[PDB]
Ligand binder design. Structure first.
Ligand SMILES: Nc1ncnc2c1ncn2[C@@H]1O[C@H](CSCC[C@H](N)C(=O)O)[C@@H](O)[C@H]1O
Ligand SMILES: Nc1ncnc2c1ncn2[C@@H]1O[C@H](CSCC[C@H](N)C(=O)O)[C@@H](O)[C@H]1O
Lengths: 451, 451
């Protein structure tokens, strides 16, 4: 990330503003509301600074820049229209390791002042680092319309209850469940905004009195096939609140960025199945919220049933959030719809790597008017070609392989069935093989990329 | 104001973390992502730290906290479990005017770490001053769903274009209307993320060529099977940006409640008076030809028995840009929410999604090692049971019917094949017929509750 947002406690800490114009005044007003001990150093001052100075709210130093005024400071702001002066300020701040903002030069000097949405004590800060002030302001207004103006009172009351919550609830999980009920209780928010203290108390005492669940839980969450935008809203909620996230190699890097930063992550990629069940079983017995993040959809060639059998065998509660399976994602993003008019009566999702000497029912798979989608069939692509042809599929049946479907690394190769073996040499796992007349729709429906 | 939010430039600046456990690992990952020149001081380090050190990512100093490690530091984080050590760290940072965070004691320090939504260079930070970390996480979750993953690339590109935008739009009112359709242009964001560097210039040059009023495009969005939580992040983002939403009765009202206020809605579903597909095709064409951002919302997944292919061919001839957001198909939703996985161990080599029109290959559907999922099949249900018994499927094959899958009114009826015709009258559209051995697992994996 380009910047690290922090929320600084400036109360009674010295800060310096150099410059005495309109820009300096708006930054000074901010620092004053944050309680800073403020010095302003400038050749001239607009009248607002004299009004602040006679109220004793800051110190004015009328004159050129004095570097020694930085000696006690925690923050420095260069707010003159003289870039030579602003750079002397920035240089002096740098040598002293004082974070310094140069208002007219965001890319220089060590901090940026963001746009602020204030629901005190709740605060939201927005900045595009100076690369796009219009987007920061567009975003700032949208956030203004979505944050209710009684949220400050809800947050203020939360702060007042924190000691009691810590005293009455022993486990972190029991305290988080209390807070999760607290922050979605609309009647409590309303009673706070109305200063209705009998109602605040009645709801609060009931909240403290509820039996808060003590169980751990396992949620199986389909990550989708790669693109982070293909996570479901419920899936995002689970990994934004998980204690632990058990993920594999087929969950994309972008989806792992949506995981709550405070969550522990355990990789189980290449690990057999007997092991994954074990991690899930024991992390859930610790009373922790566990998410098993699986590529695609958990119940389509994902051994999701096997993970849930063990937890049912152990009395551990669980749920399942379905995901965009690889077939749907690659279909959408390659421009190959899985059904279309009477091209396809049926869609077949097939595994290409099977148990022991188990054989696919090739005469069944070769039937017309269907779309075949082979999962993990890359290394058997030459056998699929041979078998489909031998069991009657026409030689010029279109085929496509979609490698890393829906991601920015997506590659699609396509051809006819007699090419399937050669085409598979040109991609690598993870890839889908799609066989069917719908493949020819690609050059009309492909919106995603030339790769 | 209690805390002043600032966005710090940390690249190549010395920062110090004291502590070497899981808490310090989370803070260190954040400061590494910000490019800090990081030293970590701890009595011991969890292995993730020695990995970072071996990779040259940071510096490890093993031993008790040493004040002089602060001597050139810009930020300090106390991340140990020992209050006495955290206090020594915070006292030593205070006397050096180094902003310091005590992870376990947010008001004992000089800065708070807020929740971060990272779309660099665009950044959003949420904090309530330690009063409400759960509220901050809830807000961060909401914002994470609203802000597209590649927004940052759009932000950076806007910055390169500011020069050109000013000297081509006189009034600042126009310039903003330009930016407003700029930061929502789907193909611009996709073309930036895919490094398709001439599609970027192709859609950049057109953005100035089009009349400022013209935002004409069609997005096919899969609404998923009913539960509003099963919409994708990307689907929600597209719905929030639409001028017009064209939807049908199989789009749940929970999903329609997510489409924002002043968007036009066009209902093309059944009113009794069947609507043929061609008039639907014309409506999208018509609404997109007036320069409006059109979202075609469809139940489930657009490319699985949704005729979505048919709607995009109408647009391809007219030169109307389109894209597709896949959705959770009914088979995936009903499988997760009825505890019937579509695959499991070696119960099924293949999953077949089939419609119930055209003529069914009955010998083919009766073959073993399949999970059969019948879409739109309730009418032919009596025929389906008769034909599958007559073509060799065992009479004791488990069947299930899932009606209104994933909604608060979902009903699931299950028996064996020879009762399939009877069970079908007990449900109504929309319903799935699932035939296969996996159906027996619902007894163990059903976590939703039946209505
Ligand atoms: N992004 C992707 N592009 C192409 N194929 C993918 C893919 N992600 C997963 N797959 C396919 O899925 C196989 C793993 S089997 C697990 C699939 C997952 N449960 C789902 O529903 O999609 C891979 O071998 C590959 O064939
Ligand atoms: N919520 C739901 N529960 C059960 N079946 C559903 C369903 N929603 C859609 N269906 C099935 O889908 C059929 C309409 S065809 C459209 C299906 C959609 N494109 C999808 O991908 O799911 C209905 O006849 C019904 O069989």
């Amino acid at each position: 990330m380009d910047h690290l947002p922090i929320f600084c406690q400036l109360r009674d800490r010295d800060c310096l503003i150099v410059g005495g114009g309109d820009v300096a005044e708006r930054k000074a007003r901010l620092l004053l509301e944050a309680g800073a001990r403020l010095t302003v150093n400038a050749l001239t001052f607009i009248p607002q600074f004299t009004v602040w100075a006679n109220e004793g709210m800051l110190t004015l130093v009328e004159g050129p820049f004095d570097e020694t005024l930085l000696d006690s400071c925690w923050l420095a702001i260069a707010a003159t229209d003289d870039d030579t002066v602003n750079q002397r300020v920035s240089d002096a701040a740098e040598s002293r390791r004082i974070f310094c903002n140069v208002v007219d030069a965001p890319k220089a000097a060590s901090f940026i002042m963001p746009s602020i949405i204030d629901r005190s004590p709740l605060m939201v800060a927005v900045s595009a680092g100076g690369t796009s002030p219009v987007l920061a302001r567009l975003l700032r207004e949208k956030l203004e319309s979505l944050l209710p103006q009684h949220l400050g009172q809800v947050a203020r009351y939360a702060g007042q209850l924190r000691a009691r919550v810590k005293k009455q609830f022993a486990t972190m999980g029991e305290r988080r469940r209390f807070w999760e009920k607290f922050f979605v209780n609309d009647r409590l928010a309303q009673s706070l905004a109305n200063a209705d203290e009998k109602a605040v108390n009645a709801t609060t005492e009931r909240l403290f009195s509820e039996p808060l669940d003590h169980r751990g839980e396992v949620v199986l969450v389909g990550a989708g096939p790669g693109d982070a935008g293909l996570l479901t809203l419920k899936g995002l909620q689970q990994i934004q609140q998980a204690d632990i996230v058990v993920y594999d190699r087929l969950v994309s890097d972008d989806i792992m960025n949506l995981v709550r930063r405070n969550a522990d992550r355990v990789f189980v990629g290449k690990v057999p199945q007997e092991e994954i069940n074990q991690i899930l079983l024991r992390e859930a017995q610790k009373g922790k919220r566990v998410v098993r993040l699986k590529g695609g959809d958990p119940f389509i060639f994902g051994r999701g049933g096997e993970e849930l059998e063990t937890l049912c065998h152990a009395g551990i509660p669980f749920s399942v959030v379905p995901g965009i399976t690889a077939a749907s994602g690659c279909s959408a993003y390659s421009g190959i719809p899985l059904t279309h008019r009477d091209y396809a009566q049926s869609v077949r999702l097939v595994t290409g790597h099977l148990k022991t000497g188990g054989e696919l029912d090739w005469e069944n798979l070769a039937a017309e008017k269907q779309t075949l989608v082979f999962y993990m069939g890359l290394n058997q692509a030459a056998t699929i070609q041979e078998k489909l042809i031998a069991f009657g599929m026409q030689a010029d049946m279109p085929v496509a392989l979609v490698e890393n479907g829906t991601s920015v690394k997506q590659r699609v190769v396509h051809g006819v069935l007699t090419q399937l073996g050669e085409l598979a040499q040109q991609v690598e796992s993870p890839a889908l093989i799609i066989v069917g007349r719908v493949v020819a729709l690609r050059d009309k429906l492909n919106w995603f990329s030339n790769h």
